Design a protein around this ligand. Sequence first.
Ligand code: CDL
Lengths: 90, 52, 110, 31
Amino acid sequence: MLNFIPKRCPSVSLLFGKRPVQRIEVGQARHQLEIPVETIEKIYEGVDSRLEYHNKDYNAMKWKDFMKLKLDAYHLLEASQSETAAKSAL
Amino acid sequence: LLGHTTSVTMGNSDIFFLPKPSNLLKIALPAFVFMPNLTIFTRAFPFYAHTS
Amino acid sequence: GFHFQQYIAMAGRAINPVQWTRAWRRMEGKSATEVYRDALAWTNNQFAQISRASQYRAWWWQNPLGMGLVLYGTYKAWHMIYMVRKQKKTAQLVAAAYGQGGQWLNPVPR
Amino acid sequence: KTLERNVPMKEILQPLWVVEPPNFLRQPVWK
Ligand SMILES: CCCCCCCCCCCCCCCCCC(=O)OC[C@H](COP(=O)([O-])OCC(O)COP(=O)([O-])OC[C@@H](COC(=O)CCCCCCCCCCCCCCCCC)OC(=O)CCCCCCCCCCCCCCCCC)OC(=O)CCCCCCCCCCCCCCCCC
């Protein structure tokens, strides 16, 4: 994934927080996934506003947080690839 | 004005400016070698310079 | 390339003297840095329009050589309009000073 | 409320900088 976080201003992302939920399509099969808007808003605390790209519609996160996120993704992916993975995240 | 006519000087007029757009290119380009590398094998240069 | 007609019109407005007074008034409370940045931004906007719109749009002059031909034509027009004119003037100058071909004469024999 | 201001396109679409090339090394030429 890229470090491009869409601006939640209505001129860019119309209707961001009008409802308490976000939805996304995942993969080639386009599975649906719903995510709480608070879980999402947790990103805009690490978002950095000095940086703006792609027609000034996307900000960038701080590398610390972005790489923590990438590491969680990578851990999940390698666990999926492996077979001795733990049956729980506890 | 016998020995003063070669003293009327005028400066050159060349401008060394040329925009260098590299965003247009994505491949490397060949480059010349101008001098032999004397920093390596310095002691043998007169002895191996004639080979290839 | 694009907007050649607009460029000709810009040159016309620039040579128009009334526009000189208009620019004199506009330059009130203005800096050389601002002027330079504005000109650079205008040029960048032109080139960015080209880079973006060439991906999906084709001008009336589109050809199997693309914008290369338009750029060559711009160069050739500049050449014939400015450099060949200067060559004509230099030719007449040399012909009046030394005679035709005077700049290529051999040194006086010793 | 209604919109009356004449909105320029530069407040919406920002052009990329292509006049001077990029420096992927983020270091000056003398360095
Ligand atoms: C003489 C030619 C030789 C020149 C000198 C030798 C130089 C050699 C190097 C050549 C380098 C070429 C430069 C390439 C860079 C890119 C240039 C470019 O593409 O944009 C040009 C530019 C087009 O601008 P643009 O950014 O593309 O925007 C288009 C507009 O939106 C408008 O949109 P549109 O859809 O309505 O139309 C689009 C486009 C359409 O262009 C076309 O597709 C051409 C249409 C006809 C197809 C056949 C073309 C050839 C035969 C007929 C035309 C003869 C003239 C030669 C035209 C050569 C260019 C094709 O419009 C035009 O370009 C009109 C050009 C025709 C004007 C005719 C004026 C007649 C006066 C001269 C007497 C008759 C000719 C005498 C014999 C000359 C024999 C050499 O054309 C202009 O000249 C703009 C004129 C603005 C009004 C000026 C006031 C009127 C003065 C009329 C003369 C204008 C200058 C033309 C001189 C030639 C006639 C003497």
